């Protein structure tokens, strides 16, 4: 249930919250900016303004419901959380985000981290290109 | 030339814009947060407020003069834009940024994008750790 998920994240149930979460769960909205999410809601006949979308996505960010990624100069995109680690390949023209998890890259990071006297705790990797 | 760089960026040549550009051009301030850059200007006895630093840095970013990196925990580090490839190892404790480049990672990245028919335009790689 979508009520339970909200309540279980310490977040009071409200209608904007439900409607924005609903959208976040749609297969094709797996990676999404506040603007795109707002536009979807418009197409869905809703009146939720973009400021609410932002306010809600922030609350979801802090509650651990979503993860915020800051893309190349400007764009924040959101996705629902998972323990399953991935990195991102981003098309600069199609608004398309491919997830990947390469073993060799994962391993190399650990060794570079250790080449310098750095204890690796987290990373982020974004590849951008034309599709 | 700084006056020229600003004009080429379509930006009015002002004193605040000059001084912040000068700090960014200093070797030991290559990767710098707005707060660090502000503090540095105070140490030079300049009269530029923290707000002005934020605003100008944003104009620079919009204008392609600087590149912004969002690091773990929601802080922005700035550097002057370059084509000179390097990636980032970031000490969460020290607040230092170590540059690195790794042939294997760079090769794997090319193979991954090719596999999804993306022509890479650029990429960011931030490794976070304790130092
Ligand atoms: Zn990864
Ligand atoms: Zn993702
Ligand atoms: Zn850099
Ligand atoms: Zn690289």
From Swiss-Prot, chains A, B:
Signal peptide: none annotated. Residues 1-82 are annotated as: DNA-binding. Keywords: Cytoplasm, DNA-binding, Iron, Metal-binding, Repressor, Transcription, Transcription regulation, Zinc. Pfam families: FUR (PF01475). It comes from Vibrio cholerae serotype O1 (strain ATCC 39315 / El Tor Inaba N16961). It is found in: Cytoplasm. Homodimer. One of its GO terms (molecular function) is zinc ion binding. NCBIfam families: PRK09462.1. Fe cation binds at residues 85, 87, 106, 123. GO terms for cellular component: cytosol. This is Ferric uptake regulation protein. Gene3D superfamilies: 3.30.1490.190, Winged helix-like DNA-binding domain superfamily/Winged helix DNA-binding domain. Fur acts as a repressor, employing Fe(2+) as a cofactor to bind the operator of the iron transport operon. Zn(2+) binds at residues 31, 79, 88, 91, 94, 99. InterPro entries: FUR, Fur_C, WH-like_DNA-bd_sf, WH_DNA-bd_sf. Residues 83-131 are annotated as: Dimerization. The keyword Zinc applies. GO terms for biological process: negative regulation of DNA-templated transcription; negative regulation of siderophore biosynthetic process. Belongs to the Fur family.
């Amino acid at each position: 249930d979508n009520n339970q998920a909200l309540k279980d994240a310490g977040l009071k149930v409200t209608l904007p919250r439900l409607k924005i979460l609903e959208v976040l769960q749609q297969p094709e909205c797996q990676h999404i900016s506040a603007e795109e999410l707002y536009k979807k809601l418009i197409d869905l006949g809703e009146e939720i303004g973009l400021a609410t979308v932002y306010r809600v996505l922030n609350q979801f960010d802090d509650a651990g419901i979503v993860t915020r990624h800051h893309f190349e100069g400007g764009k924040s995109v959101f996705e629902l959380s998972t323990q399953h680690h991935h990195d991102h390949l981003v098309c600069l023209d199609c608004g398309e985000v491919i997830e990947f998890s390469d073993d060799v890259i994962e391993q190399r990071q650990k060794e570079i981290a250790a080449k310098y006297n750095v204890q690796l705790t987290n990373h982020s990797l974004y590849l951008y290109g034309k599709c």
